Amino acid sequence: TVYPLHARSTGVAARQMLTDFDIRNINKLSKKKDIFDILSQSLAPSIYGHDHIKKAILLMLMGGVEKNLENGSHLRGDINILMVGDPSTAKSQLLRFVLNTASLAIATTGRGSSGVGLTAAVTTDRETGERRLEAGAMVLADRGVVCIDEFDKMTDVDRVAIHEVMEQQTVTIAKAGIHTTLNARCSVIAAANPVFGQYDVNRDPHQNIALPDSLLSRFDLLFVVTDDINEIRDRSISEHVLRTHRYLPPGYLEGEPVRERLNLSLAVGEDTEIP
Amino acid sequence: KIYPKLHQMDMDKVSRVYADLRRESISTGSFPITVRHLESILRIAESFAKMRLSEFVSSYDLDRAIKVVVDSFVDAQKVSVRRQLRRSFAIYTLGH
Amino acid sequence: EIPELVPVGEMPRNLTMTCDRYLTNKVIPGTRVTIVGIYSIYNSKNSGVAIRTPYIKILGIQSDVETSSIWNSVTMFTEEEEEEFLQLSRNPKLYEILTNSIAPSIFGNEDIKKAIVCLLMGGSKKILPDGMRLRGDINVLLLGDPGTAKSQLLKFVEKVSPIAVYTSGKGSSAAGLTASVQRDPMTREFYLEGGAMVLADGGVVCIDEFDKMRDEDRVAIHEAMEQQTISIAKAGITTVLNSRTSVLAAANPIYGRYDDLKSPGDNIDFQTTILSRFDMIFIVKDDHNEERDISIANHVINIHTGNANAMQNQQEENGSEISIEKMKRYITYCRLKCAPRLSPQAAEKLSSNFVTIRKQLLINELESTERSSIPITIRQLEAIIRITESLAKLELSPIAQERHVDEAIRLFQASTMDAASQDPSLSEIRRFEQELKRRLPIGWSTSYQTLRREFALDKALYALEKHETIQLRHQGQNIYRSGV
Amino acid sequence: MYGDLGNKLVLEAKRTKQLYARSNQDVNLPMYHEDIIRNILKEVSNLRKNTEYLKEQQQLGMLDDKVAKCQYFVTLLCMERNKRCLLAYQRLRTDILDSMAWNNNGLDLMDTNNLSHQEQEYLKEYCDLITDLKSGDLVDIDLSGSLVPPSDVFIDVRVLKDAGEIQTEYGVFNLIKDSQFFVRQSDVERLIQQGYLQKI
Amino acid sequence: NASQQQRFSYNPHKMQFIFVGGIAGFLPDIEDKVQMFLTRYYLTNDRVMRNENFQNSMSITPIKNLLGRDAQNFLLLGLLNKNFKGNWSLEDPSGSVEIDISQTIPTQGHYYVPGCMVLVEGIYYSVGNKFHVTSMT
Amino acid sequence: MSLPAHLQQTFSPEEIQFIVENEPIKIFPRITTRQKIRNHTRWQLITTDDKALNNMVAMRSTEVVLWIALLLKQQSKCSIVAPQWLTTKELDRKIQYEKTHPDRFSELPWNWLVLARILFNKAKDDFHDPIHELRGKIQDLREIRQIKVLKGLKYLNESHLQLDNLSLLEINELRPFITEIMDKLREIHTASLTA
Amino acid sequence: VRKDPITKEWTLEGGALVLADKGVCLIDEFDKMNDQDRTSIHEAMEQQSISISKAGIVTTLQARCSIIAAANPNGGRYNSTLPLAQNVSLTEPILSR
Amino acid sequence: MGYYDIDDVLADGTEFPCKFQYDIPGLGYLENNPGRPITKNTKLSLPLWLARILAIVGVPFVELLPPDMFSTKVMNAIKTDPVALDLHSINSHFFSLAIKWIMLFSEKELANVVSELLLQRAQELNHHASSLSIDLNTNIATSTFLLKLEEMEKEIYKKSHESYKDTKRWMFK
Ligand SMILES: Nc1ncnc2c1ncn2[C@@H]1O[C@H](COP(=O)(O)OP(=O)(O)OP(O)(O)=S)[C@@H](O)[C@H]1O
Ligand SMILES: Nc1ncnc2c1ncn2[C@@H]1O[C@H](COP(=O)(O)OP(=O)(O)O)[C@@H](O)[C@H]1O
Ligand SMILES: [Mg+2]
Ligand SMILES: [Mg+2]
C-alpha cells in the first residue's frame, strides 16, 4: 500500500480533502469585503509588518491563468517575485514560511545549487544499467513554487538556466545523446541582498543589484526592503518579536526542551463570520 | 635526547624585560612584541641548554637569549631611536 | 589512528572493523573511542600475491560522548551524576566557577570567557505553530591583534565542547564545510558526504583564520549559520538537511593591528550581511599596559616552568575550577534538561534596551554621516534573548529573570557596542579647542552649561580629555583645565 | 478562562513536589509566590464584585431566572476552582513545612524569607506543639527520634566538626576533629543528626 | 547613634534584609555610594506601590519603557534633578528623562527642590524625546 | 510529615529485618549462666522470657530470640544453629518441588531470605555446609520465585488475588506496585459500574 | 587532496610542511611569493598543525616545523632610517610568529 | 479523587470540546467576547471541572463531544499495540481523564479497553522497574520507554523502583 502524505502536515495529502462544511465556509468567507487583507495578514502572523509583501505572496501562491495560445504562443500564468532587502529583515523567514505553506514548494540556495542539479542531471540507471535523466530543483517544482535564498550568490553560468525557466517555463537538454525539452511551469520567489552590505538609496536600483536587468525583467514584482531604524516602529517590532518568543506550546512546560517525535500516525491511510 | 627544564630562573628579570619591550614597541616602535615573543626567550634559552646537552636552562642560557632578543628588536628599529633604545636595554645584557 | 600517535611526517592510518547486534549504531564519526576486539583477516577480491586484508571484529566500545546523537537525544545520565549536576546548579558562584574554568592557562579575557560560557550553553530553540522556527545557537566572532590567544581559546572550546569541529581558515572549501557531492566508485552514483560543519551538528565549529575565508566559501555558511539548514541542489539531488551548530570564528582586522586611526569599516573587510548573523563580536586590543604586561608575563612564566601543572590541579581540587569532562557532561545535561523562556518584565526590559541601542546606532551613524559597519537589527535582539535563555539554562532556571537580562545587556555592551563604538567637523573641533584654550584659564574651571551657552555632540571636549588638557569632575557639570 | 492563575500555581506546586521528592536533599521551600497569590486574589475580588453587580442589577432590572442563575452559578464555580487551587498549594507548603519541622526538631530551627508571615508563625507554633506532645505523656520515649530500627547498639564514629568537649549522659566526649570513637549508638543519635559524627 | 543602627538593605524583589575590622573599618565603600540613592528609590517605590495604588489605579511606567511610545500618558516616580546640560529631568534605575517643566501644575502643599523624588504625570514626545509634564506631586 | 513518604504504606527492608529479629531460634551458648547450688544480674526482660537466658549451659542447645543471639554472636560467646531448612538436601528438594509445580510456590518459612542474609553476614562460620554453595542455592531459589511471580502477574484481575506460600520480603518489595495497580483496576471497574 | 586515479576517491597528501614535521622548513625569497600562498602557513607556524576541511575530508595534521625564511628589503635595499614595517611588505601576524 | 490530589487538580483543568444548547446571555468573559453573549449550538473547548457541572445542570446547557483522546483512532491504536504507545504525548494525565469520563458517562467499553491497556503496560513497567543497573567497577531501552508514561505511571514506577533499589541495597550491604 502507498499513502501519499504531503504538505508537511504529517498525516494529510497534498490534495487535501474538502468537506462540504469547509466549502460552505469558504463560500461564506468569499463574501467578506476585506477577505484579501484578512488572508494576507493571516499568512505570517509572527512576521511583523510587510503587509504588501504578504499580499504579493498570497497572490503568488494562487496565481492567474496560463494562456496556451495557438501558433505555439504561450503566456505564463505564474507570478515570479524578486524581493531584495537588508540582512535580518525576515527575507529568508518569509521564504521558509512559503515553503511550509505552499502545496509544492522547493527550497534552493544560490551557493548550494548547480545548474545540472537544478534542472536535469544525466545519470545512469542501476536496475537496467544505462543512461537516464533525473529531475532538478525546478522540474520537480512544476506547477509549484521555488524559493531561492541568496539569489545574488548564484553562479552566473547556471543562472542562465533559471533565466530560461522564468522566461518560457521550459528547459532544454541537448547533451549525452539526449535531446529533450522538459516542462517546469513553476512560480519563482527569490530573496536577494544588495551589492554592498546594505542597500544604498543614494544609488539607482541597478548598481545596487549584481544581477542583469534582463534577469530582473521577467519578475512580475521587485520588492525593496529597507531596514531603516525607526523608534515607534522599532518598539512595535521588538514587542511583537518578544510576544512571539514568549509563546509556549500547549503540551509543553516552561523550561522544558521542545522534543520532537512526530509519531502521530496512530493509523495509516485515510483513518457573515468575521474572524 | 635533551629536554631542558627552566626551573633555575628569575621570573622578575624576564617579566621586566618583556614589559619594557612592549613599552618601547607601543611608544615610537613598529616591531610587534606579543606573548609569542616572550615565549621566544624561553625557547631560545631551551635551545641554548640543548646545545650544551644540559637538561636544565642555566643563567647564561637565559641571559644570552635575552640579549639576542633585545638586540634583534633594537636592530629592527630605525637608527634615529636605536641609540636610545640600546642605552635603555644595556642594563639587561650585563656580563656580555 | 590518534593524531598524537602518528609517526613524524606520516599520514594517519585507517582500519576497517565490524560491529554486531547491540554494538551497532553505538558511536558516530568524529568520536574518540577505544576498541577491544580480534585482529582478523579477510581476502578482498579487489594487488599483490597472497595478500590479505586486515580488520577488527569488535568485542567492546568505551566512548565518552555517549551513543548516537546526543545520548540518543535523551538522558543516559545515571542518578548520581544527575544529582551532582543538580547540586552544582545550586551554587551561587557557579557563574564565576565556570568563567574561571574556561581556558585557565589564558590570563584575563573575562568577558570573552563569559561569552564562551553563554555560547556553550546557548539559547532555547523555538518552533512556532505557524511553521517557521527560532534558532537557539550563538554566533561569536573574535577580532583583534595577533598573539592574543584567540586561537588558543578556539582550541580550548573545541576540546571542552561535547561536539566540536576545529577548522583552519585557508584549509577550508565550501563543498568541504557543509556537503560534498561525490560519485560512488562502484555503483557510479552520486551521493552526499557531510562536510566539516555538518559533523559539528548540535555542537560548535571553531573556525580559525576567519579572515582567510574564500569569499565564495564564506557566503555558503550564511544560510546554515542562521537558518540552521543546508540546501543542496546538485547532481540530481535536492535535499535540505539540518545543521544546528554554534559558530566561533577567529579573524584578524586588516593591517595586522586593528589600526584604529583608519575607519572601523576599513579595518574590517567583512560585509554587513555576514556581520549581521554574528551575535557577539568581541574586539580585543593590546593595551601594552606595563603592569598588565608584568601580570601576563608572570602567568606565562608559571605556565612554562611546570608551575601550571601544579597550580591548575590545586585550584581544580579547590573547587573553583573543574575538569573538561565534568564541564562537558554538565553542559550536556543542562542543554538536554532546560529550555527557559522569558518573563514579561524581562521582555519589556529587552525591548527598551533594544530601542536604546538602535537609537544609539542611529545617532552614531548621523554623526559619522556613514552607515556603521556593525549592524544592529532584530537578529541582535534575538541574540540577546538567546543569551538570556542560556544564562537561565546554565542555572537550570525554567524562566529567565531580569538578572540574566542585565548580564546579557552588559555582555552585549562590552562586545557588540564596543565594536560599534569604535571611531577613527574638524574645523569646529579646532575652533572650540582654541577658543576654550584662550578663554578658559589654564588653572581654573567653568561649568559645562557655560560652554553650551557659548556654543552639537561636542566630541571636542572628550578628545581634549583624552589629551588631558580638560577634565570633567562635578558629574560632567564642571570642566576644569587640567594644566595643559 | 479564569483558572489560569490557579493552574500555574498548582503547576509550580507539583514542580516543588518533584523537587523535594528526589532523594532527601532537605532543601528550603521555594519563595512564597505572593505575586500569584495577589493576582488570583484580585481576580476573586473582581469576580465577587461582578456577582454583587449582577445581583443588584437583577434586583433593579428585569432579568429572568435563566441568565441571572447561570452567570452567578458559573462565577461561583470559578471561585470554587480558584479556591481549590490555592488550598492545594497552601496544603503542599504546610505539609512540606511539617516534614522540615519533624525531621529538624532535633537538627536545626531555620532561610525563613521563603515563607509568608502566616507560614512562619505556623512553623513557630508547630514546633511548640510538637514539643508539647513530646513532653505531655509520651515523654519516656523520644517522639522525634530516628525512625530506622536500632539494629546495632555499639558503633564507631568520626568527628566531622570539632566541638571541643561535650558532656554526655555519664562521662564526656572530647570531639577532637579527625578522631574516632567506638561508643553506644543510643547517646550519639542527636549529634549525628546535627552533623558532628559521620560513620554510620 | 548613626554607627549603631541596623543595616536594613531592602531586597528589590520583596525583602528588607539585615546586614549589620580595623582602624579604617568604618569607611563607606564605592558600592555604598552607588546604592545610597538606590535604597531611597526602592523604599519610596515600596511606599508608592503600597499607598497610591490602593488609594488612587493607573501605575508607574519605567523611564526605559518610554522610548518607543509616541505621545501616551505616563506617570513616573523619579528623582527630580537638573542635567549636566542644565535642563530639568527625572532620574530612575530604568533611565532618565528630560522634562518640559512648562504647563505643569504641582501640589501646592509641598516643597519641591532638586534632589527630591516626585510623581510626575504627562505626555512623552519622541520627537524631542522629552516628557511634557502637566501634573506632579 | 510525621511519617516520611517512602514509609507511607510499605515497610523498609530494615523494618522487615527488625521484625524477623524477634523470631526464636536455637543456639549453643558458649557461656554457662546456670548459677550453681554453691553477684550476677539476670536479663529479666519484658519483650521475651529470660528463663532460658538465666539458665544457659555451655554447649547445651537452647532457644532464644534471634537478636539477642546476634548480640552475643558479636563476640564468640555463643553460636548460631541453622534451621533444618538451611541444609543442602532440603534446599535441593525445594528446588525440585518448585521445578515440578510451575503454578504454586514452595512451602518455605516466611522469613527465609532475611534469615539467610543475616546468618551469612554475621554467622558465616556456623554452617556444616559450604557457605559458597548455600549462597548460590539461595540465589537460585530467589530467581525461580521471581520468575514464578512474573508469570503470576499476567493474571492481575480486579477483584482479588491469592499469593499462596509466598515469602515476606518478596511481598514487602512487591506491595507498592501490586497494591497500586490493583487500586486503579478496581477504580476503573467501579466507575464503569456506576449504574 | 586529490582524486585517486586508481580507486576514484579523494585522498589527502601532505605538503612541504608535512615532510618537514619535527624538522626545519626553509623559505627562500619569503617576500616574493603570493600573499594568498603566504597566509596558508599561520596554523602551521603557530599551532604547529594543519587543518584541512575540503572535499568531505576533515582532519587536523601536525607540523612541528621550525620555519626559517629569507626575504629582500623593499627596492632591494634596506633603508635603515625607516621603521622595519616600512622596509618590508609583510604584516604583523606574519612578523609576530 | 481526593480533594488535595495535585494530579486530580491538574486533570480537572483540561479543555474538552462541547457544543451549546441555549443562547445564554452575558457569558464569554474570556471566550473571545466578554460582554457579547454565547450563542446556541456553539462548539467551544471548556475546562473539564467546569464542563462536568455544565453538562448535568439545565436539557443541559452544554453537550459534551467525544474528545480526540477517546476517538476510535486512539481506541484502535490502544487495542493494537499498548506497549509501543506514547501515551504521554497524547496527554500527561490520560488515565485520570479516562476515569472521569467513564464515571460521568458510564461508558463500559472505554473502561474495558483502558483496563487492558493499564494491565499490559503495568507488566512492562514492572519489568523495567525491577531491572537495576549494576556498575562493574541508565539503559537505552529504559529511558526510551520511560518517556511514554503519564505522571501516575511515572509515580508507580518511581515507588516500585525505589522499593526494588532499597531491597537490593539492604540485601548486598
Ligand atoms: N592573555 C593571554 N594569556 C595567556 N597566553 C596568551 C594570552 N594572550 C596571548 N597568549 C599566548 O600568545 C599565543 C597566541 O597564539 P595564537 O592563539 O595561535 O594566535 P592568536 O592569539 O589567536 O592571534 P592570531 O591567530 O595570530 S590572529 C599563545 O602562545 C598564547 O598562549
Ligand atoms: N518584520 C519582522 N518581523 C518579525 N521578525 C523579523 C522581521 N524582520 C526580521 N525579523 C527577524 O530577523 C531574523 C532573521 O531574518 P532573515 O530571514 O535572516 O532576514 P534576511 O534574509 O534579510 O537576513 C528572523 O529570525 C526574524 O525573526
Ligand atoms: Mg534570512
Ligand atoms: Mg592564533
PDB file of C-alpha atoms in Angstrom, chain C residues 345-423:
ATOM      1  CA  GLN C 345       9.183  42.095  32.714  1.00  0.00           C
ATOM      2  CA  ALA C 346      12.323  40.729  31.059  1.00  0.00           C
ATOM      3  CA  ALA C 347      10.612  41.202  27.691  1.00  0.00           C
ATOM      4  CA  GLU C 348       9.824  44.846  28.473  1.00  0.00           C
ATOM      5  CA  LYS C 349      13.398  45.472  29.626  1.00  0.00           C
ATOM      6  CA  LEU C 350      14.807  43.824  26.493  1.00  0.00           C
ATOM      7  CA  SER C 351      12.526  45.862  24.222  1.00  0.00           C
ATOM      8  CA  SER C 352      13.560  49.086  25.958  1.00  0.00           C
ATOM      9  CA  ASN C 353      17.261  48.187  25.740  1.00  0.00           C
ATOM     10  CA  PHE C 354      16.907  47.308  22.048  1.00  0.00           C
ATOM     11  CA  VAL C 355      15.243  50.651  21.330  1.00  0.00           C
ATOM     12  CA  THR C 356      18.041  52.400  23.238  1.00  0.00           C
ATOM     13  CA  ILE C 357      20.694  50.520  21.249  1.00  0.00           C
ATOM     14  CA  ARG C 358      19.032  51.303  17.918  1.00  0.00           C
ATOM     15  CA  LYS C 359      18.775  54.980  18.884  1.00  0.00           C
ATOM     16  CA  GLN C 360      22.472  54.970  19.808  1.00  0.00           C
ATOM     17  CA  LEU C 361      23.378  53.401  16.462  1.00  0.00           C
ATOM     18  CA  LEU C 362      21.201  55.943  14.644  1.00  0.00           C
ATOM     19  CA  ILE C 363      22.842  58.921  16.356  1.00  0.00           C
ATOM     20  CA  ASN C 364      26.312  57.446  15.786  1.00  0.00           C
ATOM     21  CA  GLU C 365      25.600  56.985  12.073  1.00  0.00           C
ATOM     22  CA  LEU C 366      24.155  60.503  11.868  1.00  0.00           C
ATOM     23  CA  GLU C 367      27.295  61.944  13.468  1.00  0.00           C
ATOM     24  CA  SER C 368      29.566  59.884  11.206  1.00  0.00           C
ATOM     25  CA  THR C 369      27.365  60.512   8.118  1.00  0.00           C
ATOM     26  CA  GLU C 370      28.112  56.894   7.215  1.00  0.00           C
ATOM     27  CA  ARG C 371      26.443  53.539   7.800  1.00  0.00           C
ATOM     28  CA  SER C 372      28.200  51.739  10.638  1.00  0.00           C
ATOM     29  CA  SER C 373      29.981  48.549   9.611  1.00  0.00           C
ATOM     30  CA  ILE C 374      28.492  46.943  12.739  1.00  0.00           C
ATOM     31  CA  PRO C 375      24.817  46.053  12.114  1.00  0.00           C
ATOM     32  CA  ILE C 376      22.291  46.173  14.937  1.00  0.00           C
ATOM     33  CA  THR C 377      18.942  44.694  13.932  1.00  0.00           C
ATOM     34  CA  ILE C 378      16.131  42.426  15.105  1.00  0.00           C
ATOM     35  CA  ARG C 379      18.558  39.499  14.905  1.00  0.00           C
ATOM     36  CA  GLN C 380      20.580  41.281  17.595  1.00  0.00           C
ATOM     37  CA  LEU C 381      17.504  41.313  19.848  1.00  0.00           C
ATOM     38  CA  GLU C 382      17.109  37.598  19.129  1.00  0.00           C
ATOM     39  CA  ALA C 383      20.766  37.173  20.113  1.00  0.00           C
ATOM     40  CA  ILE C 384      20.134  38.953  23.419  1.00  0.00           C
ATOM     41  CA  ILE C 385      17.073  36.758  24.010  1.00  0.00           C
ATOM     42  CA  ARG C 386      19.142  33.639  23.295  1.00  0.00           C
ATOM     43  CA  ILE C 387      21.883  34.781  25.682  1.00  0.00           C
ATOM     44  CA  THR C 388      19.282  35.417  28.391  1.00  0.00           C
ATOM     45  CA  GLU C 389      17.924  31.916  27.770  1.00  0.00           C
ATOM     46  CA  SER C 390      21.448  30.467  28.017  1.00  0.00           C
ATOM     47  CA  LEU C 391      22.063  32.314  31.291  1.00  0.00           C
ATOM     48  CA  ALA C 392      18.825  30.917  32.711  1.00  0.00           C
ATOM     49  CA  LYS C 393      19.656  27.465  31.312  1.00  0.00           C
ATOM     50  CA  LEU C 394      23.099  27.191  32.908  1.00  0.00           C
ATOM     51  CA  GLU C 395      21.306  27.847  36.213  1.00  0.00           C
ATOM     52  CA  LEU C 396      18.577  25.352  35.162  1.00  0.00           C
ATOM     53  CA  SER C 397      16.016  28.078  35.884  1.00  0.00           C
ATOM     54  CA  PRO C 398      12.774  27.283  33.995  1.00  0.00           C
ATOM     55  CA  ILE C 399      12.126  31.026  33.500  1.00  0.00           C
ATOM     56  CA  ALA C 400      14.653  33.787  32.781  1.00  0.00           C
ATOM     57  CA  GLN C 401      14.906  36.563  35.376  1.00  0.00           C
ATOM     58  CA  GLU C 402      15.965  40.183  34.875  1.00  0.00           C
ATOM     59  CA  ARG C 403      19.358  39.284  36.362  1.00  0.00           C
ATOM     60  CA  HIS C 404      20.062  37.331  33.176  1.00  0.00           C
ATOM     61  CA  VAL C 405      18.735  40.276  31.150  1.00  0.00           C
ATOM     62  CA  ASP C 406      21.088  42.677  32.936  1.00  0.00           C
ATOM     63  CA  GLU C 407      24.088  40.380  32.480  1.00  0.00           C
ATOM     64  CA  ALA C 408      23.263  39.828  28.798  1.00  0.00           C
ATOM     65  CA  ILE C 409      22.925  43.587  28.273  1.00  0.00           C
ATOM     66  CA  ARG C 410      26.287  44.077  29.988  1.00  0.00           C
ATOM     67  CA  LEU C 411      27.968  41.483  27.754  1.00  0.00           C
ATOM     68  CA  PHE C 412      26.304  42.948  24.652  1.00  0.00           C
ATOM     69  CA  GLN C 413      27.540  46.428  25.562  1.00  0.00           C
ATOM     70  CA  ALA C 414      31.001  45.017  26.306  1.00  0.00           C
ATOM     71  CA  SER C 415      31.361  43.252  22.935  1.00  0.00           C
ATOM     72  CA  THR C 416      28.949  44.414  20.227  1.00  0.00           C
ATOM     73  CA  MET C 417      28.695  48.030  21.399  1.00  0.00           C
ATOM     74  CA  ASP C 418      32.457  48.024  21.961  1.00  0.00           C
ATOM     75  CA  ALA C 419      32.793  47.081  18.294  1.00  0.00           C
ATOM     76  CA  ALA C 420      30.146  49.647  17.304  1.00  0.00           C
ATOM     77  CA  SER C 421      31.557  52.460  19.478  1.00  0.00           C
ATOM     78  CA  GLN C 422      34.895  52.495  17.634  1.00  0.00           C
ATOM     79  CA  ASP C 423      35.735  55.819  15.996  1.00  0.00           C
TER      80      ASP C 423
END
